[PDB]
PDB file of C-alpha atoms in Angstrom:
ATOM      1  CA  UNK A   1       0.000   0.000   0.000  1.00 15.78           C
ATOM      2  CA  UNK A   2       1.332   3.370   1.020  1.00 16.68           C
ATOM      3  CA  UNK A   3       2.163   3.243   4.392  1.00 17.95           C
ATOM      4  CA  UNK A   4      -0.196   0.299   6.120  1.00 18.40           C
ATOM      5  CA  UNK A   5      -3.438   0.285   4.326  1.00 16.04           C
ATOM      6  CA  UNK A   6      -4.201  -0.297   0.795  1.00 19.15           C
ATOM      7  CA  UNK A   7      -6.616   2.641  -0.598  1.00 23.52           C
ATOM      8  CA  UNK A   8      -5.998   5.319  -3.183  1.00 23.36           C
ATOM      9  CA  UNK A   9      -6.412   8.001  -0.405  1.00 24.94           C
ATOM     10  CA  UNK A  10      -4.939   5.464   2.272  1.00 23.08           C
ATOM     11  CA  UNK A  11      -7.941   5.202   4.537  1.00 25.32           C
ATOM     12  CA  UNK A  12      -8.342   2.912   7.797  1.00 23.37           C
ATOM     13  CA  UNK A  13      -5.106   3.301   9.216  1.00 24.13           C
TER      14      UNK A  13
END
């Protein structure tokens, strides 16, 4: 993902 979640706005981290 980006950082910990996979989202294209990284959401539920």
């Amino acid at each position: 993902x980006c950082d910990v979640c996979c989202n294209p706005a990284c959401a539920x981290c």
